[PDB]
């Protein structure tokens, strides 16, 4: 059916035009977008943005592939969507994200939402290590500012574990 809201749509649409190296240059941010695939990816942003020109015919295949790679079920497409929905809920519970926002109708949006929450918590740690801001970092700073005033609960728990340098 339809979701009750899509709180991070605007941020998603900004991130969908950025590039992977705008995030991978910062250690905590890199880790933020390395869930759920086990490598840094903007693919869920790309499929969720309202600004990205995509082709509908191949959307369905891309979504299937992303689900299968996330949860590692490849033998049944519907099991893999269940599997990805489970990953979403698992991470959202840890992040303190309200599960009413994530009913599993638009799994691409839901992963990007959870990644946004990860990014906003991760940015604080990179900033307190005095990284050099780029426009990706500034966008995250601005969204946090807006939320601290509007609806601080949308950012979840302040429980990001800092990445340790190699």
Resolution of this entry, Å:
2.2
| 20-to-65, 67, 81, 146 alpha-carbon distances in Å | 19, 20, 25, 25
The span from the CA of 164 to the CA of 160, in Å, is: 12
User: 3 near 109, Cβ under 8 Å?
Assistant: yes
The span from the CA of 102 to the CA of 23, in Å, is: 25
| 115-to-57, 74, 79, 131, 166 alpha-carbon distances in Å | 26, 23, 22, 20, 23
Strands (E) located in 17-102:
none
Q: Which residues of 36-71 are buried (b: 16+ CB within 10 A; e: fewer)?
A: beeebbbbbbbbbbeeeeeeeeeeeeebeebbbbbb
Q: Which residues of 1-16 are buried (b: 16+ CB within 10 A; e: fewer)?
A: eebeebbbbebbebbb
User: 42 near 24, Cβ under 8 Å?
Assistant: no
Structure-token match 């939320």, residue found: 147
The span from the CA of 123 to the CA of 110, in Å, is: 20
Other CB atoms within 10 A of residue 161 CB: 10
Structure-token match 């991070």, residue found: 8
The span from the CA of 98 to the CA of 110, in Å, is: 12
| 87-to-36, 110, 138 alpha-carbon distances in Å | 8, 10, 29
User: 42 near 29, Cβ under 8 Å?
Assistant: no
Q: Which residues of 80-104 are buried (b: 16+ CB within 10 A; e: fewer)?
A: bbebbbebbbebbeebebeeebbee
Structure token digits, residue 14: 């900004």
The span from the CA of 148 to the CA of 143, in Å, is: 9
């Amino acid at each position: 059916g339809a979701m009750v809201a899509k709180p991070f749509q605007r941020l998603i649409d900004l991130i969908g035009h950025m590039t992977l190296s705008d995030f991978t240059r910062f250690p905590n941010l890199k880790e933020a977008i390395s869930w759920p695939l086990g490598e840094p990816s903007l693919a869920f942003f790309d499929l969720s943005s309202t600004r990205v020109h995509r082709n509908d015919d191949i959307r369905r295949d891309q979504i299937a592939t992303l689900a299968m790679r996330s949860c590692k079920i490849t033998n049944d497409l519907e099991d893999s969507f269940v599997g990805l929905h489970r990953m979403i809920a698992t991470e959202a519970i840890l992040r303190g994200i309200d599960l009413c926002l994530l009913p599993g109708f638009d799994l691409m949006y839901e992963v990007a939402h959870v990644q946004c929450v990860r990014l906003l918590q991760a940015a604080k740690e990179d900033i307190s290590n005095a990284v050099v801001p780029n426009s990706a970092l500034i966008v995250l700073m601005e969204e946090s500012l807006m939320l601290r005033s509007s609806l601080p609960s949308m950012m979840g728990r302040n429980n990001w574990i800092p990445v340790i340098p190699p």
